[PDB]
Amino acid sequence: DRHITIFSPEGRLYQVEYAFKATNQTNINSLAVRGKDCTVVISQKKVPDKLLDPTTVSYIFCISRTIGMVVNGPIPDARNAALRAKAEAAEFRYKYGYDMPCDVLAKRMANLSQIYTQRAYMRPLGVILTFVSVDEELGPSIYKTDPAGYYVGYKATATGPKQQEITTNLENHFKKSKIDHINEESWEKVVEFAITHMIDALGTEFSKNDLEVGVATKDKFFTLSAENIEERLVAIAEQ
Amino acid sequence: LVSLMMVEKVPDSTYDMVGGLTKQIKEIKEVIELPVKHPELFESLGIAQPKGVILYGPPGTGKTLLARAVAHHTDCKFIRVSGAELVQKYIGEGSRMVRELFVMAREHAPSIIFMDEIDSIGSTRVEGSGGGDSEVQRTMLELLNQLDGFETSKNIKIIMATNRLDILDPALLRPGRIDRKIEFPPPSVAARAEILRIHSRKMNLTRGINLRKVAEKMNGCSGADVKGVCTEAGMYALRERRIHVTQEDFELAVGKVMNKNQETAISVAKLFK
Amino acid sequence: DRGVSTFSPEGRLFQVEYSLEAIKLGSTAIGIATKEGVVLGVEKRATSPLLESDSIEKIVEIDRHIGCAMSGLTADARSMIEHARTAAVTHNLYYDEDINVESLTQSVCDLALRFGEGASGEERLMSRPFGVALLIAGHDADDGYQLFHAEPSGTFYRYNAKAIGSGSEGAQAELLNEWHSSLTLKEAELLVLKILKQVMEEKLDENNAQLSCITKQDGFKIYDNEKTAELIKELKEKEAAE
Amino acid sequence: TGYDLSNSVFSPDGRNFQVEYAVKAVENGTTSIGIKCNDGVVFAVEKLITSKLLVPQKNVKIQVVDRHIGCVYSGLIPDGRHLVNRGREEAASFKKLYKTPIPIPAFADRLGQYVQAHTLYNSVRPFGVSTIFGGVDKNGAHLYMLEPSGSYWGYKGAATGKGRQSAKAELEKLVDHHPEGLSAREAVKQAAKIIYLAHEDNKEKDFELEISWCSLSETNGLHKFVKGDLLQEAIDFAQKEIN
Amino acid sequence: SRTTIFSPEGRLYQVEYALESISHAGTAIGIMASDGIVLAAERKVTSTLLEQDTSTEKLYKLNDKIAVAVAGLTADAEILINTARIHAQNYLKTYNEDIPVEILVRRLSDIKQGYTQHGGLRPFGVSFIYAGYDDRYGYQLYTSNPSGNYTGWKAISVGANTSAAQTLLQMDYKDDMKVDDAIELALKTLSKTTDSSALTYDRLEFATIRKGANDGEVYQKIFKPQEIKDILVKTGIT
Amino acid sequence: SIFSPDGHIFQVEYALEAVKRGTCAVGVKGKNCVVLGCERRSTLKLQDTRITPSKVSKIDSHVVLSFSGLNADSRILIEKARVEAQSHRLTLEDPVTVEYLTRYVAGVQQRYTQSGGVRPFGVSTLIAGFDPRDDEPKLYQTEPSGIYSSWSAQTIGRNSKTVREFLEKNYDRKEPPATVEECVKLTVRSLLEVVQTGAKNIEITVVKPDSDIVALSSEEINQYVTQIEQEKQE
Amino acid sequence: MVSVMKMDKSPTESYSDIGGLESQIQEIKESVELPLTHPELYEEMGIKPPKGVILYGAPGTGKTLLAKAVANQTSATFLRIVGSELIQKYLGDGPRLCRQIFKVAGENAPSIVFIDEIDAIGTKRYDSNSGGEREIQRTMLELLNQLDGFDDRGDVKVIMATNKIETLDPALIRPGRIDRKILFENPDLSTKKKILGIHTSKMNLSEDVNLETLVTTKDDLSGADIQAMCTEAGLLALRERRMQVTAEDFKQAKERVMKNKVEENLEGLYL
Amino acid sequence: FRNNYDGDTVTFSPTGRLFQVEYALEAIKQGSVTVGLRSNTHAVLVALKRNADELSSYQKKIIKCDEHMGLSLAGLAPDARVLSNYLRQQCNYSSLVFNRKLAVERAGHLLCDKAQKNTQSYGGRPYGVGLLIIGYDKSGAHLLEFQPSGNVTELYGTAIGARSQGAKTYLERTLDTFIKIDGNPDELIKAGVEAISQSLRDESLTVDNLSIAIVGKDTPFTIYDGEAVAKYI
Ligand SMILES: Nc1ncnc2c1ncn2[C@@H]1O[C@H](COP(=O)(O)OP(=O)(O)OP(=O)(O)O)[C@@H](O)[C@H]1O
Numbered sequence A: 001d002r003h004i005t006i007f008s009p010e011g012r013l014y015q016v017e018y019a020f021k022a023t024n025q026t027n028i029n030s031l032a033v034r035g036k037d038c039t040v041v042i043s044q045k046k047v048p049d050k051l052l053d054p055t056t057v058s059y060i061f062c063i064s065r066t067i068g069m070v071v072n073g074p075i076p077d078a079r080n081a082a083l084r085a086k087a088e089a090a091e092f093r094y095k096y097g098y099d100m101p102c103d104v105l106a107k108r109m110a111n112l113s114q115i116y117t118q119r120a121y122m123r124p125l126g127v128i129l130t131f132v133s134v135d136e137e138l139g140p141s142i143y144k145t146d147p148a149g150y151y152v153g154y155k156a157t158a159t160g161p162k163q164q165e166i167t168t169n170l171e172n173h174f175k176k177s178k179i180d181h182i183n184e185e186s187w188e189k190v191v192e193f194a195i196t197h198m199i200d201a202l203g204t205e206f207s208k209n210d211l212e213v214g215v216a217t218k219d220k221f222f223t224l225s226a227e228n229i230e231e232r233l234v235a236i237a238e239q
Numbered sequence B: 001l002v003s004l005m006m007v008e009k010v011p012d013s014t015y016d017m018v019g020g021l022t023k024q025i026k027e028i029k030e031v032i033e034l035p036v037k038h039p040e041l042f043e044s045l046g047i048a049q050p051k052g053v054i055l056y057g058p059p060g061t062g063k064t065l066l067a068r069a070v071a072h073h074t075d076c077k078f079i080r081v082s083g084a085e086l087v088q089k090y091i092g093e094g095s096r097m098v099r100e101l102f103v104m105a106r107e108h109a110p111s112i113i114f115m116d117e118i119d120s121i122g123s124t125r126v127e128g129s130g131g132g133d134s135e136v137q138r139t140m141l142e143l144l145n146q147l148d149g150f151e152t153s154k155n156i157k158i159i160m161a162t163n164r165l166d167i168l169d170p171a172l173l174r175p176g177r178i179d180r181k182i183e184f185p186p187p188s189v190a191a192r193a194e195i196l197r198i199h200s201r202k203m204n205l206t207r208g209i210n211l212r213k214v215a216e217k218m219n220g221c222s223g224a225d226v227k228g229v230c231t232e233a234g235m236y237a238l239r240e241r242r243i244h245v246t247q248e249d250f251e252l253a254v255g256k257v258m259n260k261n262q263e264t265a266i267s268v269a270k271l272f273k
Numbered sequence C: 001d002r003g004v005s006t007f008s009p010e011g012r013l014f015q016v017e018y019s020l021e022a023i024k025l026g027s028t029a030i031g032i033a034t035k036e037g038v039v040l041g042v043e044k045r046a047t048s049p050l051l052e053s054d055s056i057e058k059i060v061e062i063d064r065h066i067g068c069a070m071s072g073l074t075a076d077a078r079s080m081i082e083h084a085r086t087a088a089v090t091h092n093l094y095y096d097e098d099i100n101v102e103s104l105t106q107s108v109c110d111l112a113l114r115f116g117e118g119a120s121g122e123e124r125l126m127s128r129p130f131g132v133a134l135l136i137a138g139h140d141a142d143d144g145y146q147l148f149h150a151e152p153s154g155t156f157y158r159y160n161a162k163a164i165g166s167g168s169e170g171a172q173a174e175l176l177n178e179w180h181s182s183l184t185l186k187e188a189e190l191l192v193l194k195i196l197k198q199v200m201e202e203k204l205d206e207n208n209a210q211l212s213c214i215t216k217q218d219g220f221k222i223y224d225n226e227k228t229a230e231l232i233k234e235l236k237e238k239e240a241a242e
Numbered sequence D: 001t002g003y004d005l006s007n008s009v010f011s012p013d014g015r016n017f018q019v020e021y022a023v024k025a026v027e028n029g030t031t032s033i034g035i036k037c038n039d040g041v042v043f044a045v046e047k048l049i050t051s052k053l054l055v056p057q058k059n060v061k062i063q064v065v066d067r068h069i070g071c072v073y074s075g076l077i078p079d080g081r082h083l084v085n086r087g088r089e090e091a092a093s094f095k096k097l098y099k100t101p102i103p104i105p106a107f108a109d110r111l112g113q114y115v116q117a118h119t120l121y122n123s124v125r126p127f128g129v130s131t132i133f134g135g136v137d138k139n140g141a142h143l144y145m146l147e148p149s150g151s152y153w154g155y156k157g158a159a160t161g162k163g164r165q166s167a168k169a170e171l172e173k174l175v176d177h178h179p180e181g182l183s184a185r186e187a188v189k190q191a192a193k194i195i196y197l198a199h200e201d202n203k204e205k206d207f208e209l210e211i212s213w214c215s216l217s218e219t220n221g222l223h224k225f226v227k228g229d230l231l232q233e234a235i236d237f238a239q240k241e242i243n
Numbered sequence E: 001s002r003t004t005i006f007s008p009e010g011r012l013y014q015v016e017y018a019l020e021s022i023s024h025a026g027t028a029i030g031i032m033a034s035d036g037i038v039l040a041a042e043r044k045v046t047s048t049l050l051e052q053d054t055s056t057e058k059l060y061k062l063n064d065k066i067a068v069a070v071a072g073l074t075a076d077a078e079i080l081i082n083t084a085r086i087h088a089q090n091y092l093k094t095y096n097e098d099i100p101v102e103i104l105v106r107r108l109s110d111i112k113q114g115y116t117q118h119g120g121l122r123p124f125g126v127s128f129i130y131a132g133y134d135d136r137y138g139y140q141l142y143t144s145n146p147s148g149n150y151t152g153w154k155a156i157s158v159g160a161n162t163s164a165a166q167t168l169l170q171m172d173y174k175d176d177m178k179v180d181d182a183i184e185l186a187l188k189t190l191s192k193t194t195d196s197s198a199l200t201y202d203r204l205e206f207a208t209i210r211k212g213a214n215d216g217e218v219y220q221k222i223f224k225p226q227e228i229k230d231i232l233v234k235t236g237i238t
Numbered sequence F: 001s002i003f004s005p006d007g008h009i010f011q012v013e014y015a016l017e018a019v020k021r022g023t024c025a026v027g028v029k030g031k032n033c034v035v036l037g038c039e040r041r042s043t044l045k046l047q048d049t050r051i052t053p054s055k056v057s058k059i060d061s062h063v064v065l066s067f068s069g070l071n072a073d074s075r076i077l078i079e080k081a082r083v084e085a086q087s088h089r090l091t092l093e094d095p096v097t098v099e100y101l102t103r104y105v106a107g108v109q110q111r112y113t114q115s116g117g118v119r120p121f122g123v124s125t126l127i128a129g130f131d132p133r134d135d136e137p138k139l140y141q142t143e144p145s146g147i148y149s150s151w152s153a154q155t156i157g158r159n160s161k162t163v164r165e166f167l168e169k170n171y172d173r174k175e176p177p178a179t180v181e182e183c184v185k186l187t188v189r190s191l192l193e194v195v196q197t198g199a200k201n202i203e204i205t206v207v208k209p210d211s212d213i214v215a216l217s218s219e220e221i222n223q224y225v226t227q228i229e230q231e232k233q234e
Numbered sequence G: 001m002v003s004v005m006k007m008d009k010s011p012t013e014s015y016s017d018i019g020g021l022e023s024q025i026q027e028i029k030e031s032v033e034l035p036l037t038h039p040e041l042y043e044e045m046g047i048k049p050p051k052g053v054i055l056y057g058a059p060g061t062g063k064t065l066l067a068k069a070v071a072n073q074t075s076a077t078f079l080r081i082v083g084s085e086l087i088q089k090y091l092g093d094g095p096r097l098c099r100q101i102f103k104v105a106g107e108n109a110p111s112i113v114f115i116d117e118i119d120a121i122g123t124k125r126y127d128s129n130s131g132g133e134r135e136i137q138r139t140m141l142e143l144l145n146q147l148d149g150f151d152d153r154g155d156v157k158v159i160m161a162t163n164k165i166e167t168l169d170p171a172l173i174r175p176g177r178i179d180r181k182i183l184f185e186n187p188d189l190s191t192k193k194k195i196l197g198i199h200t201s202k203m204n205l206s207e208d209v210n211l212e213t214l215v216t217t218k219d220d221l222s223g224a225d226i227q228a229m230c231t232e233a234g235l236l237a238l239r240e241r242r243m244q245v246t247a248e249d250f251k252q253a254k255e256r257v258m259k260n261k262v263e264e265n266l267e268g269l270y271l
Numbered sequence H: 001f002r003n004n005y006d007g008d009t010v011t012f013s014p015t016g017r018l019f020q021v022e023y024a025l026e027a028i029k030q031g032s033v034t035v036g037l038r039s040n041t042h043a044v045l046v047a048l049k050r051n052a053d054e055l056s057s058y059q060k061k062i063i064k065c066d067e068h069m070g071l072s073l074a075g076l077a078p079d080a081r082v083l084s085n086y087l088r089q090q091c092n093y094s095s096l097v098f099n100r101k102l103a104v105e106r107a108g109h110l111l112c113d114k115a116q117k118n119t120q121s122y123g124g125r126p127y128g129v130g131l132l133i134i135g136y137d138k139s140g141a142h143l144l145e146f147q148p149s150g151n152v153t154e155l156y157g158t159a160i161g162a163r164s165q166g167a168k169t170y171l172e173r174t175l176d177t178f179i180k181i182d183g184n185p186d187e188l189i190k191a192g193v194e195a196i197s198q199s200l201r202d203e204s205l206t207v208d209n210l211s212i213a214i215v216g217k218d219t220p221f222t223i224y225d226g227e228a229v230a231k232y233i
């Protein structure tokens, strides 16, 4: 029972509760919010050795000119999910003539995880995901996945070993201003709220390289580079 | 030790406290009664005054309560082991006591024994897991059927007993080593009728009484339930300060059995029709 | 509790080497080479008299000029001979000429290897291997009356003569002592009977055994129930004399 | 304990220890490095001799996949060669497409998921190898290393075998000394130093060296092994660094 | 447990559990006169809210001369009927005549061991009752089991104490025992074997065959609740 | 299904014991006639035996079979055997021999031995009949290992040990069965030792040339069994 | 120890009144009796006849009935012990006592012994790491080594018994020591034959014989219960006062007692 | 004591080993010897043969691939045969696709790419032998080594299997010498033959227990077995 995806004696799946814990190999925390007409996503970027090329290191990908995603897990397990995304956007629009939403495409890859729990030739994947996009019909939105298939939106959320340190810290905020997403327009002037909240709630101070960023701009998704972050960090000059 | 031995203080029961049971005494007394009552009569043919017998059946019966009264109206002794007390946390204590056991009855031909439970000496299997208890079932059966048992079977009949039958050693039974067995089933309704006549002998010039009107209703197994419902029927009268009693106050006492007659919840699994 | 395609720490496989003693349960089956002909012999293991031993066929005829004799487990080998008959005849087509023996017999021992990576591009038939071994005898015009031996491990040797089965470890010693170059045919049509009379569990009959020669002049030939008997008297012509 | 017997059986720790045993197989192998120079890459490797009967310079361990690449490995000799034979046709089925050479991110994006596929199933052997590759595209210089769990990251340098602890701290002792930029020819000297410097874990035995680089400058960014005095120039030098 | 192989002494590990398992299931009997046929089944449950009215579960039909009963899984039997139904009407577009049974079962149950024989797949947790008619062997009656061996009979039970229940037909059955003289045996065959002697028309299910229509036609008649409800009084229950 | 180290097979040192449980039957090879004889459950009440699958079965106009052991694994062979029968009459235009299909089905009981996830049979069978355009009797016996033999008498079933040797006090090669009344007396004087009941517990059948098949009533049996029920007296 | 041993009181169990079998029983007399008749014959061809035998179980099927019949015949000593009675709290007491038989077997050349149901001694060589019970395993080694250390065999005879072998008894027995591992089980007819061959002695069957059908239809059973079959007819005689001996009420006992111990009867599948 | 990592192939050890393989390579240790060496111009095969009884013919040890190649084996014939019949196609394919005939060393670099396709799939064993490959091309002569592992290497001369260290030692005693030989294969051949007497556990070689077959920068493959090798003993 403790080696395969049959139903347990009592009726859980020991091979799956492991997989959630197969994520936490890295001591890494990431975060997700909704802008006004934009969005934001971030995570730690650890570098415990001197010789890397952090030009190369990344978890935050690019799937369209529209959307993006993130990972807190083993990246080899991620890339197989990463590739299968790029495919499953194309075959949608090639068959219907318009770009791939998020709500659907999670509903695909959430269907996909099930038939990794319903057969036994396959190893599942010890990752989770937080897709991000604008939508011309639905607006700024995100969706999360587990390796089982539970996928749900979030007005704003985060993940890592240390959800309790911050996830309370966010719910305390909306019980202080009480709306879904922020009342601030430009993406440049709301990422400050994210990085203001991490180090303060329970997080540790950061530097230039320590973090990485993604933004699902209207008809544009893209990462950020060093001074593009350092400038945006120096917003703290005033606060 | 003689604590196990029979008693100058016999119990006070009787095989006419025992309604519904009517036929079995005729079927089992004689092996215990007749050829020992008249060995010359039996020896007129002298087929084999057999070894002991056995009784199987559920609880709710009073197989015990039968065996309490038979030790009255005996002409013989009736010893008791207080079942499973014979064993101890050692090895050598087993066989000596069994050696002591038979001889304790050799000196008394008109005298017999009693077991209640042989669930604890049943179905010996061994590959390293087992126990010394299996060692003792042999020697008793050995000294049951050997150069020195038939002289007891000249002097003796015996009985075993339990409540679960087919969970023991068949290698025990050479039929002839046990020459007869019997069922003590649950009762009939009308068999239940004369029961409550026995124990509720407490009405006080009352009337409107229909003793038949309770095994009217029952589908149980025990006869003891006739007491369990009766005994707590009077409890109502006991609490409400009026010694008297009637049918309906006696009837809802089955409400206690409303649990027992309905405690067996049921599954909804229509996997197969 | 072993499998097929798994070595041991000692290297000696289990199952195939276990397949190299099932033969030692079976019957006896001998053939001996003379430079003017070769013989074949059998022990029917006839279990009851009512039986009609014409039906039991431990001996076959590939063609008019080649025959073999299966031992150990007579059942399964009934399949493989049909392979050999196919390759014989097939080679009798593409070249209009009888085949050399060694061109054939490599094929048969290329069959029983099929339980895992047979010849070039072989899908694994044969969940288990052939629990049977046999002897091949016949002429081709390049080497001589080259007897051949086969065993399901997937190798063949060439012999002067030897044996199989029940009487293997003991009987061959006499054969090892009593073969040479310049002997006859019929001396080998009878020397076997000195041997097989040893390791039969009953006095010989004309129906316990049977024989078949092989000749580059006529070709193949099985004998009759009686024409074994006449030479047994010829053996008793020496068993009674000496 | 009882979960450490086959592929694709995660742990309560959240792992499959079997590949973590693979790391000790590749630990049982030769030294090998490759450096990100200022304009290309370098390759150099350990190649130990058992008997004199082994010929020198007929038994390379570098492999080429196409013109603008060099790749090496360490540990299991065959297994690290298989995926090359997958490599040598993949990019060939990519130059087939838009008629241009292949990038290096195209390489790992077309390999680093492959070996992963040999850790999904209960029917195959994880490639017990660590592996290097490098070369040039239109964009410029690149370098990468692989580990048998599919992972890979863009380094400035790498190391494998039982030449780990020497070189890693050494390159830590190198980079700060020379961060300004290290051209091709000069690293060909300083590289072969390290292997003579790293054999001391196994200085019971002997070897001989094998080197290759590729420069956008020198060789038109093509792949070209070493064979000449330039090698002999370096061994004459590298002995001094250990002298 | 490796469905293919045998015991160490010539037996099977699984399948002896199966036809022993089905004993857990309900009851389904089936008899025959020289005049007509009767069938019966006691539903595993007879709670009140659910739709026991139109609950057609134990008794299905196949064509306009045949009826069956069921014992086993709800589903693994539910497919065989859709299978065998086709093998009936696919007999007809070749030949256009009506179907006989003696071809059907002999050409049906051989599917069974086909899953004992290979694939490592389990056999079918099912047994049947059969019933029907051909113009060549008269009225008929047959049965089956997860093995495949089929047996002709005059009256049979399955399920709970069927060995016990088959006794109850032993003494009472008659050769010329007519329909209305034989129907009452069935529910009386069940009026004893029941767990709940408290008996409800709801709990069971029923079916019939006759040759009621003149010109030799027949009737695959199946009986509704309030009918058999009133039939029940005829033998005199209440 | 593999090889033990004792030269045996686990699953097939087992299977042929299965046939040693079930019914018992036999045939013989008369002077100019051939016969079978088999078993039935007397006391099987509330039943009509007209339609039950007989242990006998027919394969062609001129050949028959009698299985034992299981019953399911028997039905399959007759079908694919029947195919080969009414196919062999087509391509070659001649009817079958006896050995041909025997040689065939001798092969199928190992095509269902050496493969993955395939049990052999709980079946052993034999056959009987005259070749076309000939006279000499032919009967062959089978078992799951495939080895097909030619026994002048062959029985597979319960209490069969002495039955396997009972004939040897009864049969003579140079004193074969004269006629049907004795040769069927032979057919029954064997089987009755395990019958232990009346005629109802058996079923028999016979062959003669040009497809002269017969099956005999329970009453015809009660004609002759009496004659030795009368001659089991002196 | 000696007290139980010398059981010289053979019952009226009549050897050769028993109707069981011959070949087994010559095999023991050949094993035992004839060696005590003209053992020069063994000296003719120079034979060391065996050191006792071991029957098997199949309980209620004639384990012992011969044995006390042999004791009725024994014409020598006869011995009887129990391993459970042999064993004690302290260490090596019984093992110290087990030795003391063979000298008391050295008592006699006519030295023979039955043994009582070994199933708790020498059963199986579990490691017995779990304390205490190694005493048994410490005892069997005290015997078998005593049995064949250095013995001229001194007519040190033996006959053993049990109810099931493969349950136990892995290595204790060895050939020569016990060459004859032999059997007793149901005959499949001869219970019909010679059992009532005995019991026809007393009874009358006061109307007929009826025995031509008071018989076995290959019914799986054990003829030991036939001594019930004789019984209850007399009882059912006296359930209705028949002082004579009937054949009609005799029917029930097989219909009554043989009917209890039911079998599966799953032979609607091997037809 | 009982390594459960001894079953199917793919299971690594807790130390980085495939216990199937390492327990396979001792096979050839239980197999015989077949040695070989080369000059700059001519290379050799050699093989003791292992005979059954005083009657049988002998087990063979050498096979030709094609006109410019041969080989020799150790341990098992049957799994070793198919590789011979295998690469014949991969030496005909050359001479029909191209006609630019086959270079030796890529064959080994084909051959190593075979067995590795047999270790890492459930079912299937290694082609568990060692063997020796020879021949000539435009590049001179070449000798090879084989392991069922996959490792194959360009050697001057080596040895295999039982009793082989004695012959193995002559070569290191002599690698200064035999490399400088040319056009004179006779004395070259007897180098190994004298050197493999180091292995003889008193079986004292004969006319027929030995098989030799060589190649050159001129010679096609020739076999010297039967009775022609009275030359050397
Ligand atoms: N007909 C009866 N006459 C007298 N007492 C009865 C009768 N029927 C049931 N009983 C009662 O049943 C009780 C014991 O019966 P039951 O079989 O339930 O347990 P038991 O026989 O004591 O248990 P065990 O036999 O396991 O020791 C007694 O209290 C007794 O009064």
Ligand SMILES: Nc1ncnc2c1ncn2[C@@H]1O[C@H](COP(=O)(O)OP(=O)(O)OP(=O)(O)O)[C@@H](O)[C@H]1O
Pocket: B141, B142, B144, B145, B146, B174, B176, B177, G018, G019, G020, G059, G060, G061, G062, G063, G064, G065, G195, G223, G224, G225, G227
């Ligand atoms: N052939 C026979 N004739 C008469 N009685 C028999 C025969 N076979 C068995 N029996 C009966 O079997 C009973 C005991 O047989 P058996 O010797 O097998 O067991 P036992 O010796 O009593 O048991 P244990 O050895 O365990 O004490 C006797 O009562 C005897 O009547």
